[PDB]
Design an enzyme around this catalytic site. Structure first.
Site, short mmCIF file in Angstrom:
data_model
loop_
_atom_site.label_atom_id
_atom_site.label_comp_id
_atom_site.label_asym_id
_atom_site.label_seq_id
_atom_site.Cartn_x
_atom_site.Cartn_y
_atom_site.Cartn_z
N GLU F 58 39.42 -0.17 78.11
CA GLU F 58 40.07 -0.52 79.37
C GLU F 58 40.28 0.74 80.22
OE1 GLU F 58 44.27 -0.88 80.52
OE2 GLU F 58 44.17 -2.96 79.85
N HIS F 59 40.33 1.90 79.55
CA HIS F 59 40.52 3.18 80.21
C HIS F 59 39.26 3.75 80.86
CE1 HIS F 59 44.51 5.36 79.13
NE2 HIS F 59 44.74 4.09 79.42
N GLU F 135 50.14 8.47 77.25
CA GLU F 135 50.76 7.22 77.62
C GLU F 135 51.56 6.60 76.49
OE1 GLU F 135 47.37 4.92 78.95
OE2 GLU F 135 47.78 5.62 81.00
#
Ligand SMILES: CCCCCCCCCCCCCCCCCC(=O)OC[C@H](COP(=O)([O-])OCC(O)COP(=O)([O-])OC[C@@H](COC(=O)CCCCCCCCCCCCCCCCC)OC(=O)CCCCCCCCCCCCCCCCC)OC(=O)CCCCCCCCCCCCCCCCC
Ligand SMILES: CCCCCCCC/C=C\CCCCCCCC(=O)OC[C@H](COP(=O)(O)OCCN)OC(=O)CCCCCCC/C=C\CCCCCCCC
Ligand code: HEM
Ligand code: HEM
Ligand code: HEM
Ligand code: HEM
Ligand SMILES: CC(/C=C/[C@@]1(C)[C@H](C)CCC(=O)[C@@H]1C)=C\Cc1c(O)c(Cl)c(C)c(C=O)c1O
Ligand SMILES: CC(/C=C/[C@@]1(C)[C@H](C)CCC(=O)[C@@H]1C)=C\Cc1c(O)c(Cl)c(C)c(C=O)c1O
Ligand SMILES: CC(/C=C/[C@@]1(C)[C@H](C)CCC(=O)[C@@H]1C)=C\Cc1c(O)c(Cl)c(C)c(C=O)c1O
Lengths: 422, 55, 101, 59, 49, 442, 271, 54
Positions: F58-59, F135
Site C-alpha cells: 500500500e506504501h 509510522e
C-alpha cells in the site's frame, strides 16, 4: 417520480433571505446562517461568542433543555453550531419526514433563547474543556496568535474564549450579543432536501427578532505583529503572512491561484507533491521530515495570505527561509503559463468536490445567499477562475514580498528566525 | 499523616468521630435527651440484669 | 367575600414562623425539588434567606423570639422561592411523562 | 447432547437454575435416603428391631 | 511496539474441544458451560439436602 | 417524502469481465466523481512470514509503475486535480481516485496500472522500510488502536485475524522485493477485485475502459477460483497491558459476531444504537437518550465510549470501548455491562423506535459523497455479494422491534465468555471472573 | 429519616418482647398467665398456628421448657438491642440530627462535646431522681401485685392486667370482640408506626408552625392516655364502649386525620 | 449510586469487607483458618443456645 428542481431564493421585506433546493435526497439539512462572531466582541465581552456556541442546548422560550435533546434524538436528528470569526451557522439534519419536528427546536434555539443564570453558569466550565481538546492541534494554536499579530481589532479577537474570562460571562452579555447581531437582515435560512414554499412559510410565519444591522464590526485595522511561543514541543509550527484580499474582491481569485501554484496540501497519500513549488522548494533545502503550504484566508473587510511550515526544531531555519525565496522567485516571473493552467484545474476540482457532501453544499449555498442574497452558477465561478492571467499571479506574489508581514510560531523556537531576518 | 491521635487511631477516631467531634444542631431541645437516656438505660438494664442472672 | 383572605391571614399568624423572622418559604422542608430550587436562587436572595434561618436557629437555642415590632407581616411576606420551585416541579413532570412514552 | 440440552433449558436462565436445584434436591433426597437406609439395614441383618420385631408382635 | 506482542500458547491448558485454531469454539460452548454449571447445580442440590 | 426518495435513487449496475473482475457504479448528475478498485485481500490473508506485505505494498502503490516512474506518475495525477488515496485492512484493501467526470476513463487506466504493473523499485523499498518502521512508532502511541489490535490479538488469538495490519517489526525489517511481488501476484487478481465508481459517469463507458486496461486472462479453473479462508477461533480471554504512567485507561470488551452474511447484523446495529456513544464535548449532556451516556455524564464515568459491530467474512466482534481515568474504570465497566444486560432482558418499544431512526440516518450519512458511495459499492460486492439498496436496508431496519432485539442480543451476549483488552493505569478494573459474571442477570 | 426510624420501630418491638419475657421469669401469677396468653396469640394464625404454639411452649401447655427457653431468650435479646441501637445511630449519622424548627442547621452546627455531653449528663441526673425516688421510697408503685403469688395453672386471677406499659395495647385487644380481629388490631396498634413516614402531607417538616396538627397531636396523646386507663379497668360498661371509641379514635387520627389536616394546612399557606 | 453495593450504609459493608476486599493472590491454605475460626463461633453460639434452652 422525482427529477430536477431549481435553486430558488426569496428575500422577505425585513432582509431575511430564504435559499432552498429540492435534490430529493432521503435526508434534509436546514440551517440558519448569521453574520455574528467573535469579531463583534469587545475587550469587555470577549468569549461571549464562544459560549453562545455551546449554549445551543439550553432552554428556550418554547422548548426545554431536556426536550430539545430528547426531541431531536427521538427522530435520529442532530443539531450543530459551526462558527468563524465572523459567521455562525446553526443547523439541524434529519430524515425527510421529520423536518417539522427538528425545525421547532432550530427556530427556538436561534430566536428564543433564555440563557437562564443557573444553566448558563453550570455550562461555563465547559469552555475550559472544549478549548483544551481543540488546542491539542498546535495547528489551532498558531492561528490564534496569528490573527492576533495580524490585526489590532475585530478579526484579532480569539475564536476560543480566553482563560481569564472563563466563568465571568453573564446572561446579559449572551442576550445583548444575540439581540444586537441575530437580526433578520443578517440572517439567511438556507436548506436542502426541502421545497421552497415550505422552508419559506416557516422563516416568515415563525421567525422574528429584531431587524437591521444592529451593532456593526469595527473595520479590521492591520498590525503586522510577531508572536512567538517558546514551549519545548519538538516541532516548530510557523506562519508568515501579509494582508491578502477580501471576499468577493477581484484580487482574490489571483491568490487562490497563487495558492495552488505554490502548493496547497498533497493530493496523493504519502505523496511528494511535485506540482507544489513551495513543497519541492523546501525539500531541496532540508533533509529531515516536514510540510509547508499556501495559507489563504478571505474575510469580509480584509484577508490573509502566506505560507505555513511544520519542521523539526533544528531545521526550522532553513525550512522557513527556503520557504521564502521560493515565494520571491515566484514574484519575479517564476510562474509558467502552464503552472497557471494546472493550478486553475486543481482549483475547479477542489471546489467541485467540496460540494458533494451535504454539509459542504449547504455551506456553499448559504455563505453566498448571505453575503449577497444571490447565487453564482458553478459555471460562472468557473470563468472567474481561469480569467486570471499569468500576470495577476506574479502580482499577488509581489504584493506579498512588499507588504508588511505578520508571523506566528510555537515550539522549540531556538532555531526559528525573527520576521526581521527574512 | 494525622497529627492528633484522636482523628487517626482506628478506634478513638470512632469514639471521637461519633461522640465528641460530632456535628450537632445548636438548637436541639430537651426532647432530644431521650436518645442518651434510652442508651444509658440499656447499659444499666444489662448490668443489673447479669448481676441477677447470677442468682 | 374576603373569606379565604380572612382565613389565610389568620392561619399565617397562627403558625408563628414570622415571630422568628422567617418568610413562609424559609420553612419549606428541603426535599429534592426544594433543594434544586434553592441552587437557582440569586446570590443575594440566598444569602439573606440564610441569615434569616441562622438567626431563627439562634433564637430557638435561646428560647426567645423577635420583639413584636420585627415580626413579618402577612402581606409583606416575599414568596422568594415559590416561582423557582414551581418550574423545577414542572420541568420534572415533563421528564417523568416523557420517559413513560 | 444432554450437556447442551441441559445448559440451554436448565442452567442458562438463573431462575430455571433454581427450580432445578429445588426439584432436584427433592428427588435426590427421597432416593439417597432409601439407598443409605437400605445399605445400613443390610449391613446389620437380624440385629435391628425391624427384624426381631415379628417374634413378639401379633401375627 | 504493540505489533510485536502476541498471546502465548495455552494448548497446555485448553479444553479438548477448543484446542484447534480453525474450529468455531462456539459449537462446544453450550457443553463446556452446561458441564461446569451442572457441577455447580449439583453442589447446590447436595448442600440443599 | 422519505419512502419515495428512497426508491428513486439510481440502481447500481453490475457486469463481470470474463477474467473475474467485476464492474459496477451508481450514476448521478454530479459533474465530479470517484472510481477505485476494491481488492478482497488484507492481513488475514498474510501468513506469519509475510505479515505486513499488504501494507508494505500500500506504501509503494503510489511511488510509480513500470510504464511511468515516480515524478511522471505523481505529476500526471496532480496536474489534473485528481485525488489518489486508499487503504488496507485485515481482509479488504482498496485504491481509489477522486476526479472530474471527464477523466473517468483516463483514471481507470491509472488504477489498473498500479494493481498490475507496480514498479517496486528497490531504491524505494529501502526508503519505505524506514518510513513504515517510523509510522509504527507513531501509531503505537494511539491508545484507541493499540487497544483494538490487542483486542483481536487475544480475541482471535492463535489465528490469522489475531495479526496487526502493519505486521511485525522483524517482517518489515526483512521483507524482500520478492515477497511484495509474490503478494501482489497471488492476491491482486481480477476475480478478487472490484472496479467501483459513482457520480456522473456512464456505466457503459466505464465497463469499456475496463475491458481495455483491465485485461488479464484466465485459462484453468484455479485462476477463476476465489479461495475460502481457514476459520478463525474466538477465545474468551483477556490481555492486560499496564502502565500507570499513562494519563487515562482504555478498555475494550467484545463477544464473537456473526459475519457479514447473517441478517442479524441489522438487529445488532439497532441494538448498538440504543446504547450509542458519548464523549466529553457532547452538548446534549445529562439529557441524552442513551442511558449509559447519561450515567456517564451524571457520575463522570468517562471521557468517551462507543459501541461497535465490526464484521468479517465468517466471524466478527460486537462490543464497546471506553476511555476513563484510573479511578472510575470500575463503575464505568459496571454500568456498561449493565446496559448490555438490559438489552438482552428489558428493551422497550420506545428505545427501539429511536434506535431505528438513528440507524436510518447513519445509514444515509454513509452515502454522503462520491467516495463514500463508491466505498459502499466496493465493499458490498466484495462482502455481501451484490449491492444492498437503501430502500432494502430500510425495510429490514423497520422489521425490527423489541422482542427481536432481546432475542438476538441474548443470542450473542448472554452468558458468553467475552474478550477483554485493557491498556494504561488499569488497576481499578479487575478479575476476568468478575467481568465474566457481568454477562448474566440484569 | 426513614431508616433511622424503621430501625427504631424494630428497637421498640424488641424492647417489648424483652420486657415481656423478663416479667415471666419470676414465675408468678402474671408471669404464667401472661406467658399463656401471649404465646397463644400465634394460635390466631391459620394452620401453622396451633403448631407455632407447640414450639413456643416446648410441650402441650406452658411448663418448664417454656420458662427455660424464656430465660435464654431474655438473656439474649438485650444484646441484639444494643447491636441494632448501633445501626440506628449509624443511619442517623448519615443525615445528622433534626431540630425543632425543622430547617437545615448546617448554617449553625456545634461539637457534641461539651455542649450536648454536659446537657445529657444533666438530663441524666434529672430522670435519675424520680427513678430513684420511686424505686427507693415506693418500690411497688408501678407494678402489678399478682406476681407475688406463685403461678397456679388452674386459677386465672380475676384482676389480670399486664405491666403498665402494655395496657394501651391490651386495651385495643379487648375492643375487637373477635379472635383474629383483636389480634390483628393489636399487631397493627404498634406496627402502624411503620406507616407514619408515608402519611406525611405537610410541606413543612415539624408541627412547630402547624397549630392544627398540634391539636390533633395532643388529642392523640390524651387518646392513648385513655386507653391505658381503659386497659386497667374490667370488661364492663361504660368502659367497653369508651374502649372501642378510643381505639377507633387512635387509628383514625393516624391513618385519616393527620394526613388530611396536613393537606388542608398546605392550602391555608397558599401552597 | 451507581451500584447499590458501594453506597448503601450496610451492603457497602458486606461488600467492603468480604467481596471487594483486596486479597493477595498467593495466600495458602494456612489462611483458611480465619474463616473456619469465624464459622466455629457462629456454630458454637447456635448449638449453644439450643442447649441453654434445656
Ligand atoms: C432545673 C430545670 C430548669 C428550670 C427552668 O424551667 O428554667 C427556667 C429558668 C431559665 O430560663 P430560660 O433560659 O429562658 O429557659 C430556657 C430553658 O428551658 C432552660 O433550661 P435548660 O435548657 O438550661 O435545661 C434543660 C432541662 C430543663 O429541665 C426541665 O425542663 C425540668 O431539661 C433537660 O436537661 C432534659 C432532662 C429531662 C429528664 C426527665 C426524665 C423523664 C422521667 C419522667 C417521669 O431558670 C430559672 O428560672 C432559674 C431556676 C434556678
Ligand atoms: C403508649 C402508652 C404511653 C402512656 C402515656 C404517657 C403520656 C404521659 C403524659 C403526657 C406527657 C407530655 C408532657 C407535656 C409537655 C407540654 C409541652 O411542652 O408542649 C409544648 C411543646 C412546644 O412545641 P414547639 O412548637 O416545638 O416549641 C418551639 C417554638 N416555641 O411541645 C413539645 O414538647 C413537643 C411534643 C413532645 C412529645 C411528647 C408526647 C408524649 C408521649 C406520647 C407517645 C406518643 C406516640 C405514640 C406511641 C405509640 C406506641
Ligand atoms: C433502643 C431504643 C432506642 C435507643 C437507645 C435510641 C437511641 C437514639 C439516640 C441516642 C438518638 C440520638 C439522640 C436523639 O435525637 O434522641 C436517637 C435518635 C433517633 N431515634 Fe432513637 N433510639 C431508640 C428507639 C427509637 C425508636 C423506638 C424510634 C422510633 C419509633 C426512634 C427514632 C429515632 C429517630 C427518628 C432519631 C432521630 C431524632 C432526630 O430527629 O433528631 N428511636 N435514637
Ligand atoms: C432490655 C433490657 C432489659 C429489660 C427491658 C429487662 C426487663 C426485665 C423485666 C421486666 C423483668 C421482670 C422484673 C420483675 O418485675 O421482677 C426482668 C427480670 C429479669 N431480667 Fe431482665 N431485663 C433486661 C435485661 C436483662 C439481661 C440481659 C439480664 C441478664 C444478663 C436480665 C436478667 C433478668 C433476670 C434474671 C430476671 C428475673 C428475676 C427478677 O425479676 O429479678 N435482664 N427483666
Ligand atoms: C476468635 C478467634 C479468632 C478468629 C475468629 C480470627 C479470625 C481471623 C480472620 C477471619 C482472619 C483473616 C483470614 C486469615 O488470615 O486467617 C484473621 C487474620 C489474622 N489473625 Fe485471627 N482470628 C482469631 C484469633 C487470632 C489469634 C489467637 C491470633 C493471634 C495469636 C490471630 C492472629 C491473626 C493475624 C496476625 C491475622 C493476619 C493474618 C495474616 O497475616 O494474613 N487471630 N483472623
Ligand atoms: C465460645 C463458643 C463456645 C464454646 C467454646 C463453648 C464450649 C463449651 C464447652 C467446652 C462445654 C462443655 C461441653 C461438654 O459437655 O463436654 C459447653 C457446654 C455448654 N455450653 Fe458452650 N460453648 C460456646 C458457646 C455457648 C453459648 C453462647 C451457649 C448458649 C447460648 C452455650 C451453652 C452451653 C451449655 C448450656 C452447655 C452445658 C451443657 C452441655 O455440656 O451440653 N455455649 N460449651
Ligand atoms: C449515648 C450518648 C451519650 C452518652 C454518654 C455515656 C457519653 C459517651 C459520655 C458522658 C455521658 O454520661 C453520656 C450520657 C449520646 C447519644 C446521642 C447521639 O448518638 C447523637 Cl448522634 C446525638 C446527635 C445526640 C444529641 O444529643 C446524642 O445525645
Ligand atoms: C400487650 C400485649 C402484647 C404485646 C406484644 C405481643 C406485641 C403485639 C408485639 C411485640 C411483643 O413482643 C409484645 C410482648 C398483649 C396483651 C396481654 C398482655 O400483655 C399480658 Cl402481659 C397479659 C397477661 C394478657 C392477658 O390477657 C394480655 O391480653
Ligand atoms: C469469615 C470469612 C468468610 C465467611 C463466609 C461465611 C462468607 C460471608 C460467605 C460464604 C462463606 O461460606 C464464607 C465461609 C472470611 C474471613 C476472611 C477475612 O476476614 C479477611 Cl479480612 C481475609 C483477607 C480473608 C482471606 O481469605 C478471609 O477469609
Amino acid at each position: 417520480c422525482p427529477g430536477a428542481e431549481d435553486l430558488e431564493i426569496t428575500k422577505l421585506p425585513n432582509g431575511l433571505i430564504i435559499a432552498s433546493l429540492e435534490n430529493f435526497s432521503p435526508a434534509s439539512r436546514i440551517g440558519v446562517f448569521i453574520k455574528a462572531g467573535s469579531r463583534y466582541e469587545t475587550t469587555a465581552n470577549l468569549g461571549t461568542a464562544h459560549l453562545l456556541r455551546l449554549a445551543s442546548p439550553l432552554t428556550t422560550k418554547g422548548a426545554s433543555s431536556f426536550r430539545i435533546t430528547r426531541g431531536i434524538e427521538a427522530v435520529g436528528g442532530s443539531l450543530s453550531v459551526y462558527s468563524t470569526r465572523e459567521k455562525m451557522t446553526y443547523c439541524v439534519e434529519c430524515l425527510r419526514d421529520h423536518v417539522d419536528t427538528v425545525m421547532e427546536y432550530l427556530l427556538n434555539v436561534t430566536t428564543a433563547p433564555e440563557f437562564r443564570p443557573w444553566e448558563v453558569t453550570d455550562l461555563q466550565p465547559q469552555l475550559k474543556v472544549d478549548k483544551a481538546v481543540a488546542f491539542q492541534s498546535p495547528q489551532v494554536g498558531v492561528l490564534e496568535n496569528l490573527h492576533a499579530a495580524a490585526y489590532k481589532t475585530a478579526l484579532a479577537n480569539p475564536l476560543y474564549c480566553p482563560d481569564y474570562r472563563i466563568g465571568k460571562i453573564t446572561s446579559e452579555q449572551l442576550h445583548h450579543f444575540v439581540q444586537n447581531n441575530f437580526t433578520s437582515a443578517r440572517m439567511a435560512l438556507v436548506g436542502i432536501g426541502v421545497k421552497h414554499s415550505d422552508l419559506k412559510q416557516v422563516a416568515e410565519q415563525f421567525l422574528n427578532i429584531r431587524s437591521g444591522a444592529g451593532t456593526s464590526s469595527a473595520k479590521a485595522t492591520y498590525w503586522g505583529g510577531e508572536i512567538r511561543e517558546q514551549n519545548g514541543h519538538s516541532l516548530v509550527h510557523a506562519a508568515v503572512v501579509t494582508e491578502g484580499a477580501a471576499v468577493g474582491s477581484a484580487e482574490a481569485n489571483a491568490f487562490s491561484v497563487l495558492q495552488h501554484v505554490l502548493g496547497a496540501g498533497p493530493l496523493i497519500k504519502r505523496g511528494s507533491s511535485v506540482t507544489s513549488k513551495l513543497y519541492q522548494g523546501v525539500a531541496k533545502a532540508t533533509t529531515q521530515p516536514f510540510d509547508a503550504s499556501a495559507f489563504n484566508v478571505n474575510y469580509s473587510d480584509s484577508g490573509l495570505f502566506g505560507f505555513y511550515t511544520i519542521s523539526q526544531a533544528a531545521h526550522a531555519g532553513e525550512v522557513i527561509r527556503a520557504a521564502m525565496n521560493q515565494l520571491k522567485a515566484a514574484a519575479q516571473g517564476g510562474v509558467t503559463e502552464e503552472d497557471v493552467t494546472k493550478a486553475k484545474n486543481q482549483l475547479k476540482a477542489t471546489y467541485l468536490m467540496s460540494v458533494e457532501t451535504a454539509q459542504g453544499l449547504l455551506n456553499e449555498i448559504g455563505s453566498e445567499a448571505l453575503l449577497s442574497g444571490t447565487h453564482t452558477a458553478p459555471s460562472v465561478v468557473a470563468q472567474k477562475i481561469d480569467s486570471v492571467t499569468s500576470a495577476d499571479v506574479v502580482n499577488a506574489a509581489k504584493k506579498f514580498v512588499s507588504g508588511k508581514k505578520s508571523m506566528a510560531a510555537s515550539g522549540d523556537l531556538g532555531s526559528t528566525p525573527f520576521l526581521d531576518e527574512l | 499523616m494525622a497529627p492528633n491521635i484522636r482523628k487517626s487511631h482506628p478506634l478513638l477516631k470512632m469514639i471521637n468521630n461519633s461522640l465528641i467531634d460530632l456535628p450537632a444542631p445548636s438548637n436541639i431541645s430537651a426532647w432530644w435527651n431521650f436518645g442518651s437516656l434510652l442508651a444509658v438505660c440499656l447499659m444499666t438494664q444489662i448490668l443489673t440484669g447479669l448481676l441477677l442472672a447470677m442468682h | 367575600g374576603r373569606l379565604m383572605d380572612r382565613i389565610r391571614k389568620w392561619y399565617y399568624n397562627a403558625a408563628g414562623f414570622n415571630k422568628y423572622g422567617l418568610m413562609r418559604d424559609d420553612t419549606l422542608y428541603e426535599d429534592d425539588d426544594v433543594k434544586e430550587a434553592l441552587k437557582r436562587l440569586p446570590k443575594d436572595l440566598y444569602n439573606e434567606r440564610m441569615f434569616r434561618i441562622k438567626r431563627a436557629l439562634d433564637l430557638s437555642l435561646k428560647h426567645r423570639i423577635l420583639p413584636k415590632e420585627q415580626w413579618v407581616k402577612y402581606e409583606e411576606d416575599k414568596p422568594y422561592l415559590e416561582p423557582y420551585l414551581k418550574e423545577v416541579i414542572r420541568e420534572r413532570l415533563e421528564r417523568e411523562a416523557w420517559n413513560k412514552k | 447432547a444432554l450437556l447442551r440440552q441441559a445448559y440451554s433449558a436448565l442452567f442458562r436462565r438463573t431462575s430455571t437454575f433454581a427450580l432445578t436445584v429445588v426439584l432436584g434436591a427433592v428427588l435426590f433426597e427421597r432416593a439417597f435416603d432409601q439407598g443409605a437406609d437400605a445399605i445400613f439395614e443390610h449391613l446389620n441383618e437380624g440385629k435391628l428391631w425391624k427384624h426381631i420385631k415379628h417374634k413378639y408382635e401379633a401375627s | 511496539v504493540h505489533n510485536d506482542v502476541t498471546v502465548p500458547d495455552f494448548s497446555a491448558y485448553r479444553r479438548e474441544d477448543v484446542m484447534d485454531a480453525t474450529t468455531s469454539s462456539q459449537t462446544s460452548s453450550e457443553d463446556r458451560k452446561g458441564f461446569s454449571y451442572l457441577v455447580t447445580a449439583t453442589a447446590c442440590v447436595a448442600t440443599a439436602y | 417524502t422519505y419512502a419515495q426518495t428512497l426508491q428513486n435513487i439510481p440502481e447500481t449496475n453490475v457486469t463481470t469481465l470474463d477474467n473475474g473482475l467485476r464492474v459496477a457504479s451508481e450514476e448521478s448528475s454530479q459533474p465530479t466523481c470517484t472510481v477505485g478498485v476494491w481488492i478482497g485481500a488484507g492481513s488475514r490473508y498474510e501468513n506469519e512470514k509475510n505479515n505486513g506485505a499488504g501494507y508494505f505494498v500500500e506504501h509503494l502503490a503510489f511511488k510509480g509503475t513500470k510504464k511511468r516512474p515516480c515524478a511522471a506518475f505523481e505529476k500526471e495525477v496532480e496536474s489534473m486535480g485528481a485525488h489518489f488515496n486508499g487503504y488496507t485492512s485485515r481482509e479488504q484493501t482498496a485504491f481509489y481516485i477522486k476526479a472530474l467526470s471527464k477523466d473517468m476513463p483516463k483514471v481507470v487506466e491509472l488504477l489498473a496500472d498500479v494493481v498490475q504493473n507496480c514498479a517496486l523499485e528497490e531504491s524505494q523499498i529501502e526508503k519505505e522500510r524506514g518510513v513504515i518502521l517510523q509510522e509504527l512508532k507513531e501509531m503505537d502511541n494511539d491508545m484507541t488502536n493499540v487497544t483494538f489490535d490487542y483486542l483481536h490479538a487475544t480475541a482471535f488469538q492463535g489465528t490469522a485475524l489475531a495479526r496487526t495490519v502493519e505486521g511485525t517489526t522483524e517482517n518489515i525489517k526483512h521483507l524482500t522485493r520478492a515477497d511484495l511481488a509474490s503478494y501482489i501476484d497471488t492476491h491482486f487478481k481480477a476475480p478478487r477485485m472490484v472496479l467501483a465508481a459513482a457520480g456522473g459517469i456512464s456505466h457503459k463507458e466505464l465497463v469499456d475502459a475496463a475491458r481495455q486496461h483491465f485485461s488479464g486472462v484466465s485459462f484453468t479453473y484455479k485462476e477463476d477460483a476465489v479461495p475460502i479462508l481457514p476459520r478463525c477461533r474466538f477465545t474468551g480471554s483477556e490481555i492486560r497491558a499496564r502502565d500507570d504512567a499513562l494519563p487515562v485507561a482504555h478498555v475494550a470488551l467484545a463477544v464473537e459476531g456473526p459475519g457479514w452474511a447473517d441478517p442479524d447484523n441489522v438487529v445488532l446495529h439497532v441494538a448498538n444504537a440504543i446504547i450509542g456513544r458519548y464523549d466529553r464535548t457532547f452538548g446534549g449532556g445529562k439529557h441524552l437518550s442513551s442511558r449509559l451516556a447519561a450515567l456517564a455524564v451524571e457520575h463522570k464515568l468517562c471521557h468517551s465510549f462507543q459501541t461497535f459491530n465490526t464484521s468479517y467474512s465468517d466471524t466478527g466482534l460486537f462490543g464497546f470501548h471506553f476511555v476513563a481515568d484510573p479511578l472510575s474504570i470500575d463503575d464505568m465497566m459496571f454500568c456498561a455491562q449493565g446496559e448490555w444486560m438490559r438489552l438482552c432482558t428489558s428493551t422497550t418499544e420506545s428505545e427501539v423506535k429511536r434506535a431505528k431512526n438513528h440507524l436510518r440516518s447513519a445509514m444515509v450519512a454513509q452515502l454522503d459523497g462520491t467516495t463514500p458511495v463508491c466505498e459502499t459499492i466496493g465493499s458490498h460486492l466484495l462482502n455481501y455479494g451484490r449491492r444492498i439498496s437503501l430502500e432494502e436496508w430500510d425495510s429490514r431496519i423497520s422489521a425490527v422491534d423489541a422482542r427481536m432485539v432481546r432475542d438476538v442480543c441474548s443470542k450473542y451476549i448472554y452468558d458468553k465468555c467475552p474478550a477483554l483488552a485493557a491498556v494504561g493505569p488499569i488497576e481499578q478494573l479487575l478479575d476476568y471472573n468478575r467481568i465474566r459474571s457481568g454477562m448474566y442477570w440484569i | 429519616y426513614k431508616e433511622t426510624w424503621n430501625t427504631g420501630v424494630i428497637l421498640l418491638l424488641t424492647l417489648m418482647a424483652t420486657a415481656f419475657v423478663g416479667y415471666v421469669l419470676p414465675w408468678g401469677q402474671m408471669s404464667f398467665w401472661g406467658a399463656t396468653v401471649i404465646t397463644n396469640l400465634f394460635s390466631a394464625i391459620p394452620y401453622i398456628g396451633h403448631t407455632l404454639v407447640e414450639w413456643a411452649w416446648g410441650g402441650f401447655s406452658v411448663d418448664n421448657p417454656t420458662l427455660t427457653r424464656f430465660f435464654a431468650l431474655h438473656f439474649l435479646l438485650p444484646f441484639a438491642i444494643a447491636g441494632i441501637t448501633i445501626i440506628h445511630l449509624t443511619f442517623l449519622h448519615e443525615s445528622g440530627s433534626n431540630n425543632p424548627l425543622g430547617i437545615s442547621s448546617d448554617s449553625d452546627k456545634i461539637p457534641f462535646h461539651p455542649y450536648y455531653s454536659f446537657k445529657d449528663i444533666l438530663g441524666l441526673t434529672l430522670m435519675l431522681t424520680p427513678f430513684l425516688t420511686l424505686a427507693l421510697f415506693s418500690p411497688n408503685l408501678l407494678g402489678d401485685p399478682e406476681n407475688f403469688t406463685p403461678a397456679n395453672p388452674l386459677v386465672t386471677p380475676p384482676h389480670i392486667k399486664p405491666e403498665w406499659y402494655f395496657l394501651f395495647a391490651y386495651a385495643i385487644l379487648r375492643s375487637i370482640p373477635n379472635k383474629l380481629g383483636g389480634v390483628l388490631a393489636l399487631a397493627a396498634s404498634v406496627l402502624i408506626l411503620f406507616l407514619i413516614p408515608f402519611l406525611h402531607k405537610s410541606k413543612q417538616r415539624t408541627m412547630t408552625f402547624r397549630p392544627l396538627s398540634q391539636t390533633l397531636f395532643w388529642l392523640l396523646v390524651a387518646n392513648l392516655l385513655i386507653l391505658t386507663w381503659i386497659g386497667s379497668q374490667p370488661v364492663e360498661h361504660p368502659f367497653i364502649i369508651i374502649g372501642q371509641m378510643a381505639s377507633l379514635s387512635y387509628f383514625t387520627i393516624l391513618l385519616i386525620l393527620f394526613p388530611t389536616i396536613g393537606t388542608l394546612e398546605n392550602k391555608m399557606l397558599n401552597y
